[PDB]
Design a protein around this ligand. Structure first.
Ligand SMILES: [K+]
Ligand SMILES: [K+]
Ligand SMILES: [K+]
Ligand SMILES: [K+]
Ligand SMILES: [K+]
Ligand SMILES: [K+]
Ligand SMILES: [K+]
Ligand SMILES: [Mg+2]
Ligand SMILES: [Mg+2]
Ligand SMILES: [Mg+2]
Ligand SMILES: [Mg+2]
Ligand SMILES: [Mg+2]
Ligand SMILES: [Mg+2]
Ligand SMILES: [Mg+2]
Ligand SMILES: [Mg+2]
Ligand SMILES: [Mg+2]
Ligand SMILES: [Mg+2]
Ligand SMILES: [Mg+2]
Ligand SMILES: [Mg+2]
Ligand SMILES: [Zn+2]
Lengths: 50, 104, 140, 185, 140, 71, 142, 64, 75
RNA sequence: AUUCCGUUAACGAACGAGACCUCAGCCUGCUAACUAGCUAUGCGGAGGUUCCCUUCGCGGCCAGCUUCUUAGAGGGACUACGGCCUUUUAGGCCGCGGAAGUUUGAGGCAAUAACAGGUCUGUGAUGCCCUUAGAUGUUCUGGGCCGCACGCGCGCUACACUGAUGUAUUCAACGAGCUUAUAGCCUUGGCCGACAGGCCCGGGUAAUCUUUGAAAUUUCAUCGUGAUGGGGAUAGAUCAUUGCAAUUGUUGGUCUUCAACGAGGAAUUCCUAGUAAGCGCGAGUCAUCAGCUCGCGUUGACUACGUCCCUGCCCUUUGUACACACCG
RNA sequence: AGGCUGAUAACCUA
């Protein structure tokens, strides 16, 4: 049960907000999927300038 | 007796960061201490570019997200106790104050 | 006027200094001089029979102009574009054995030495040898 | 007039004349109109209409040599080609290469064209533009898949065009353009 | 210490000329300006000297440091820095009328000798590979 | 184009109506007057108002205008 | 420069192949299967043959010396990694196979894989790509 | 027969043609400066510049 | 389109022509000699060096991509 | 520009547009820097003629300074000024000066009313329906998602001499980087190796270390119009690396093999200046894998300064048997 | 078979 290694690859990583394993943003350690990050981008401190 | 103490300030808000820097420099000039700074490091621009659409349909539009980090460095020539007194003042929100003894 | 390395054309100096190194007979060429290429980015071996002396002269000039260059630095210096068939070209490094062997030979000749901060540094004898060769180059 | 500026520090602008009223004000090859040492200026000639008429004619030839796509932006090579071509022109013709270039431009510029189809006149600025385009197109075509170098092909094209001989690619195209225009009068 | 330091700009190329009272030395990063590379662009770097003449530079020593940009843009930055440095030196240490005379000559030949070019690279926008170029559009 | 909008035109007329004595025919002097007698959020807006007001001052010199009432 | 003598040959025969005499010796040997530009260059150097002359100018003795180098690369100190047949499946030896010998080697490799019904051998038999390429859109020639 | 003539543009009547690629101008002959006609010109043209006319007999209709 | 057949080495007939006719050419380049003498560009480059050694032709311009030569004495 | 001037049974307002915000372009003026430098000086190395000259290295929190670098605060353009054209208007054209005279350039933001447009496979967003222990839950092993007579779309590499190859030579910007466990990230330096790669001593949680940081190009030589040293698909042999696992080749090397392709039919895309195109670099994905995407700089043009002919859009008049609105 | 058209016919190319 859960014997297969999960040390690397998409299976090991999941979104910290929703748990989905797709489109994870690993830059700067965000560990959030692209959909969740855009929703929470303003709160995290990211802003759109140009 | 006199040591070169380095104070590093980081913040996302320029006005708050500049306000604290002025207070520390102005707070040290009152004690007639030698002050080197503030020295403004190049601004760090964290950038995240992501697809706007939650799906893949439509024109491929992108949002460019920026989180700018401003860093200031101030060097004070005085004992740690005097520097501790100056930095003990209340700091504005979002400004991170880090006091370390310069290794020279 | 008194001409130094900086006062002469780089192309002329390398040719003049390359013959100087070969003329001295102090460099000991490796067994694989005629077999190897100057990096995996190359298709064929160098055309010039005396390419080893030419490369040694070029490396000595660069150490003269700047100190602290290591083997990895020289791999980048003599690297370039690598063609990947139907794929786009990309930067590739050159051979490290050629660079390392040349540096070790020049150090035995006392032209360069170990920089305390890392890499190779030009010695006093090396500066004299390079400067004297540059001064003998005819004006052109 | 007299000027101390020599193109490539080899060719003198003194004695260069534009013997054509129509295109005299749109060709910059005389000593009085801003002579240049080199045909490589990072100028801004597209900012306004008719502004590129002030660009030196030699430099305009240099720009038109940066074709096709494989040669875009390689202006240093283009300047070399014209530099070698002018040297070749001097040997063969024993004349000032600048004078030969302006003669080729004047002779290779069509003076009538068909539009919509009926015959219409060509403005002097477009006439210069067409002459430059035709001269470089002929040199490029002859050099392709040929032992002859681009500089040698450019020199022969300019020499023939300046002389008015039909052997020039540009001269033949000019006659064809004007031949069709006459038929549509 | 009658010296001035004027800069020249072209795209991302910045060249600073240190002009001081001297005998006529002109070097770029320690290399004589007669060895400027590439050779075909050597004419552009020499335009200020050719237009004004060596006799104008006989009383100064120019040492030029250039950084950034590329091969072509650095020449223009050096070309501009030399012109500005001589004008500044004449204004501050020679005379005002002499500065007026040389400045007119430089301006008449080319205004970029003293005025920087403001053009810069336009940023890339999504939906294409260039600033203006768009991805090829297909309907069926 | 360089057509002034209602914000620039409307503000310029109001300034001239109640500060005609202070206003002059020089743009550089006028833009300093606006800072003293008005609150313009942006520098660029202030320059446009100062320039158009200077244009209106020239209009008043030659004759009367439509939207400005000088008592 | 130099005037060709009567000994100049326009066509040469090496290992049952036609070698052009007007080509440079280095690039004239590339017509032989199993010999490329890299191996042609090293062979000339080991044979003490000037590579600045044309193939037709070489004498019969000089031409033969080139094939001795190709036949015995290890005798001339050519390294093993430079050979097109390294660690042979049957003998385990290192050699440079050229002309029909190279063709025979290729035939044996495919026959061996097909005989054991190896997957790579089967795709060779079926005429399909064997190196993992997608076949949906490319390679359409039938 | 047709005799080449040189004329100077006096005024720009306006851009004409289906796609606006033609310009109608009023030209004054240099040899005889008391003669005026209208000509259609292809390519950029401005008042003052000179034109070469292969045939001077034709005249373009207004708003052609 | 017929294939050109440029000799890689001179023969007695063509070599004598080079020594006599080429010196009189106003423009001498590897391609000019290649077309007139039906010789390869490689042979033309070697031939030009021989003419330089004999002093029959003088140099006008030198470049890796384009070499320009001319008769040593005019006419 | 529903931008404004005016007309006027309308008068006065609200959104969008503009303003605005970010980046870029000017500042030898302000603030001030041992995580950025310059100049001078001292000492030392080399060259030339002990002084002197040229060049390079090192040192100085008491050489000085802020031109170059960084980034805060401000200044700067308003079409200001001249000529001409417009109605006293609004405004337009050209020109001097100016870093800049297209709202200076490029972006971000962005109305009303709509589409049965996409997404239930981003979501511990969700109604109803289905299934729920011989499960459509979950996990494990293996295979597949890539399978190849064929058609289509975005692209990469090419058909060469304005070139390929081999030398010599040489200039960017955006950005990214670690749990320290022997060490998991970016890696300098030394050594071993032809390459790939390996070993050892270290630096950097960063303007500090990688970063002393590209290619096209420049230069000399060779090749010589021959599918040729153009092109590098296909294929054989063998080596090494990532991983628990590489076969249906993960990728990276070595030798060998050396296909079409000689500029492309009908048709059709993008683009007006540091733009097109060429050239490489970083980032995202990432144990390994880039021909993709998002940014960055480097080289740097032709043509136009128009028109409504084609494809469309906005507004007035007019016709209508259409309103699911001419695909009527 | 491809192209042209939102699609078919018509038309165009191979
Ligand atoms: K290199
Ligand atoms: K297939
Ligand atoms: K010294
Ligand atoms: K959803
Ligand atoms: K649902
Ligand atoms: K997701
Ligand atoms: K291959
Ligand atoms: Mg072969
Ligand atoms: Mg596959
Ligand atoms: Mg400053
Ligand atoms: Mg400001
Ligand atoms: Mg809207
Ligand atoms: Mg639907
Ligand atoms: Mg799939
Ligand atoms: Mg796409
Ligand atoms: Mg090749
Ligand atoms: Mg660099
Ligand atoms: Mg081939
Ligand atoms: Mg993708
Ligand atoms: Zn998520």
């Amino acid at each position: 049960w859960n014997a297969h290694p999960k040390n690397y690859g998409p299976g090991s990583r999941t979104c910290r907000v929703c748990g989905n394993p797709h489109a994870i943003i690993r830059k700067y350690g965000l560990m959030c999927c692209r959909q969740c990050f855009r929703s929470n981008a303003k709160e995290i401190g990211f802003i759109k300038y140009r | 007796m006199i040591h070169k103490i380095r104070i590093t300030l980081s913040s996302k808000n320029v006005k708050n960061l500049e306000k604290v820097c002025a207070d520390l420099v102005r707070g040290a000039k009152d004690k007639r201490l030698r002050v080197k700074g503030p020295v403004r490091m190049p601004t760090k621009v964290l950038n995240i570019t992501t697809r706007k659409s939650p799906c893949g349909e439509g024109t491929n539009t992108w949002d460019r997200f920026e989180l700018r980090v401003h860093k200031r460095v101030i060097d004070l020539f005085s004992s740690p106790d005097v520097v501790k007194q100056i930095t003990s003042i209340t700091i504005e929100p979002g400004v991170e104050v880090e006091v370390t003894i310069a290794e020279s | 006027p008194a001409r130094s390395v900086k006062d002469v054309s780089p192309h002329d100096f390398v040719k003049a200094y390359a013959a100087h190194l070969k003329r001295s007979g102090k460099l000991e060429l490796p067994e694989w001089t005629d077999i190897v290429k100057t990096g995996k980015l190359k298709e064929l071996a160098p055309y010039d029979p005396d390419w080893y002396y030419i490369r040694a002269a070029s490396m000595a000039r660069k150490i003269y102009l700047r100190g602290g260059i290591g083997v990895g630095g020289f791999r980048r210096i003599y690297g370039g574009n690598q063609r990947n068939g139907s794929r786009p070209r990309h930067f590739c490094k050159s051979s490290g054995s050629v660079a390392r062997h040349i540096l070790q030979q020049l150090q035995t000749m006392n032209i360069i030495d170990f920089d305390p901060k890392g890499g190779r540094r030009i010695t006093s004898n090396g500066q004299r040898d390079l400067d004297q060769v540059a001064g003998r180059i005819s004006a052109a | 007039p007299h000027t101390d500026v020599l193109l490539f520090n080899r060719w003198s602008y003194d004695g260069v004349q534009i013997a054509d009223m129509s295109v005299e004000d749109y060709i910059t090859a005389t000593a009085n109109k801003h002579p240049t040492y080199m045909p490589h200026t990072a100028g801004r000639y597209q900012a306004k209409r008719f502004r590129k008429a002030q660009c030196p004619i030699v430099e305009r030839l240099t720009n038109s040599l940066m074709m096709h796509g494989r040669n875009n932006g390689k202006k240093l090579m283009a300047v070399r080609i014209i530099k070698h071509a002018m040297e070749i022109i001097h040997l063969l013709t024993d004349q000032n290469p600048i004078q030969v270039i302006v003669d080729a431009v004047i002779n290779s510029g069509p003076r009538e064209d068909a539009t919509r189809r009926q015959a219409v006149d060509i403005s002097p600025l477009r006439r210069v533009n067409q002459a430059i385009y035709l001269l470089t197109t002929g040199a490029r075509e002859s050099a392709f898949r040929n032992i002859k170098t681009i500089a040698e092909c450019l020199a022969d094209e300019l020499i023939n065009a300046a002389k008015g001989s039909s052997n020039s690619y540009a001269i033949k195209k000019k006659d064809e353009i004007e031949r069709v225009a006459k038929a549509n009068r | 210490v009658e010296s001035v330091q004027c800069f020249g700009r072209k795209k991302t190329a910045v060249a600073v000329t240190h002009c001081k009272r001297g005998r006529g030395l002109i070097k770029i990063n320690g290399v004589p300006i007669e060895l400027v590379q590439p050779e075909i662009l050597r004419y552009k770097a020499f335009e200020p000297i050719l237009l004004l003449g060596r006799h104008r530079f006989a009383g100064v020593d120019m040492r030029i440091r250039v950084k950034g940009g590329g091969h072509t843009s650095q020449i223009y930055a050096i070309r501009q820095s030399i012109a500005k440095a001589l004008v500044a030196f004449y204004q501050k240490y020679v005379d005002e009328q002499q500065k007026k005379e040389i400045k007119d000559i430089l301006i008449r030949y080319d205004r970029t000798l003293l005025v920087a070019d403001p053009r810069r690279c336009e940023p890339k926008k999504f939906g294409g590979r260039g600033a203006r170029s768009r991805f090829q559009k297909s309907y069926r | 184009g360089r057509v002034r909008t209602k914000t620039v035109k409307k503000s310029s007329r109001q300034v001239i109506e109640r500060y005609y004595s202070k206003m002059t025919l020089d743009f550089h002097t006028n833009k300093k007057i606006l800072e003293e007698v008005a609150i313009i959020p942006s520098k660029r807006l202030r320059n446009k108002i100062a320039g158009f007001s200077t244009h209106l001052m020239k209009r008043i010199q030659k004759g009367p205008v439509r939207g400005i009432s000088l008592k | 420069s130099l005037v060709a003598n009567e000994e100049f040959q326009h066509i040469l025969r090496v290992q049952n192949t036609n070698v052009d005499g007007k080509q440079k010796i280095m690039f004239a040997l590339t017509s032989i299967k199993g010999i490329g530009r890299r191996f042609a260059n090293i062979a000339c150097k080991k044979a003490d043959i000037d590579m600045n002359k044309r193939a037709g100018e070489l004498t019969a003795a000089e031409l033969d010396s080139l094939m001795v180098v190709v036949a015995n690369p290890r005798q001339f100190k050519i390294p093993d990694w430079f050979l097109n047949r390294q660690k042979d499946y049957k003998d385990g030896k290192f050699s440079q196979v050229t002309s029909n010998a190279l063709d025979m080697k290729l035939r044996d490799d495919l026959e061996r894989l097909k005989k054991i019904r190896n997957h790579r051998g089967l795709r060779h038999y079926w005429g399909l790509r064997v190196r993992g390429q997608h076949t949906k859109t490319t390679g359409r020639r039938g | 027969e047709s005799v080449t003539k040189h004329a100077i543009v006096i005024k720009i009547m306006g851009r004409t043609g289906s796609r606006g690629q033609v310009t109608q101008v009023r030209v004054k002959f240099l040899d005889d400066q008391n003669r005026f006609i209208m000509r259609n010109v292809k390519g950029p043209v401005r008042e003052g510049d000179i034109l070469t006319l292969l045939e001077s007999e034709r005249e373009a209709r207004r708003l052609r | 389109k017929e294939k050109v057949n440029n000799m890689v080495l001179f023969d007695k007939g063509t070599y004598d022509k080079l020594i006599t006719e080429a010196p009189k050419y106003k423009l001498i380049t590897p391609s000019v000699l290649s077309d007139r003498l039906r010789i390869s560009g490689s042979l033309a480059r070697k031939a030009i060096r021989e003419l330089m050694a004999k002093g029959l032709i003088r140099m006008v311009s030198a470049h890796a991509s384009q070499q320009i030569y001319t008769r040593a004495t005019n006419t």
